[PDB]
Design a protein around this ligand. Structure first.
Ligand code: KSR
Length: 271
């Protein structure tokens, strides 16, 4: 729909940017208020840094993916500078939160709780025939009530047929990305499952970088041998064995996201 007819389009006057949370190559991220009272997060596009159409594609995708466990699109300003306005998450990135004084005091119980909420969000995505492709602690946001939500749908895709294949020159974070997606550029919901496995190590290690003390080539090489990530410190063996299902050699052998939720809910209540 055209902006003058789009229900997500708002006048720019309704927004007040209060505090800059981040700045990068492609724009900024602010905490602000909509109509005076409603805390929102504003992502503004740096005019010229990238394509307005490419920028907005993230918003259009969020129109299709609405759920309590996914960070919600709030509105767009489609005149330059382009704004994407979203649900505000008071506790920010999971990778950052786990490192704060509060984050540090969480029981393994609450950690499993959180892990279950993420998998619940991914189950909705799995069921809607989407993939995320960028799943990792840095892209999970945390509310003021210590609940978690999927974020960053920049690379997220709808799957008409089974697979989305990226460019041959396309490059992805090597520690989080499934072998097939690194090697062949082929992504499926199953390659998100692999990332989920890695994310579990970030949760239990409180946001430490995966594969401690290993370069990418060493990581790619260990995997090809049949090795997986060394048991993280203080990791329940149950959770570790769950990570392992996520890291199965064949995509189709990796569990569903609905299975992972249900399993993580059993771990959680049993503690
Ligand atoms: C740059 O990363 C940060 C650092 C601190 C932060 C943030 C992001 C956020 C935050 C970023 C963010 N982005 C979208 C929707 N909700 C959000 N909440 C809140 N705090 C307190």
């Amino acid at each position: 729909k055209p902006w003058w007819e789009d229900e997500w389009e708002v006048p720019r006057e309704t927004l007040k940017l209060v505090e800059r949370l981040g700045a990068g190559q492609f724009g900024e991220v602010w905490m602000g208020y909509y109509n005076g009272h409603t805390k929102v997060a504003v992502k503004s596009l740096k005019q010229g840094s990238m394509s307005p159409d490419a920028f907005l594609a993230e918003a259009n995708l969020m129109k299709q993916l609405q759920h309590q466990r996914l960070v919600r699109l709030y509105a767009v300003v489609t005149q330059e500078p382009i704004y994407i306005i979203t649900e505000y998450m008071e506790n920010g990135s999971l990778v950052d939160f786990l490192k704060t004084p509060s984050g540090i005091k969480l029981t393994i119980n609450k950690l499993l709780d959180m892990a279950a909420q993420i998998a619940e969000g991914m189950a909705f995505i799995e069921e809607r025939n989407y993939i995320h492709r960028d799943l990792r602690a840095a892209n999970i946001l945390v509310s003021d009530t210590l609940s978690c939500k999927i974020a960053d749908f920049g690379l997220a895709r709808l799957i008409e047929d089974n697979e989305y294949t990226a460019r041959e020159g396309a490059k992805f974070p090597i520690k989080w990305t499934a072998p097939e997606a690194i090697n062949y550029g082929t992504f499926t919901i199953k390659s998100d499952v692999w990332s989920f496995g890695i994310l579990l190590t970030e949760i239990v290690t409180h946001g430490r970088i995966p594969y401690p003390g290993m370069t990418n080539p060493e990581v790619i090489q260990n995997l090809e041998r049949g090795y997986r990530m060394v048991r993280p410190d203080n990791c329940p063996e149950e959770l570790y064995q769950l990570m392992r299902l996520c890291w199965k050699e064949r995509p189709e052998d990796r569990p569903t996201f609905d299975y992972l939720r249900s399993v993580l809910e059993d771990f959680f209540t049993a503690t």
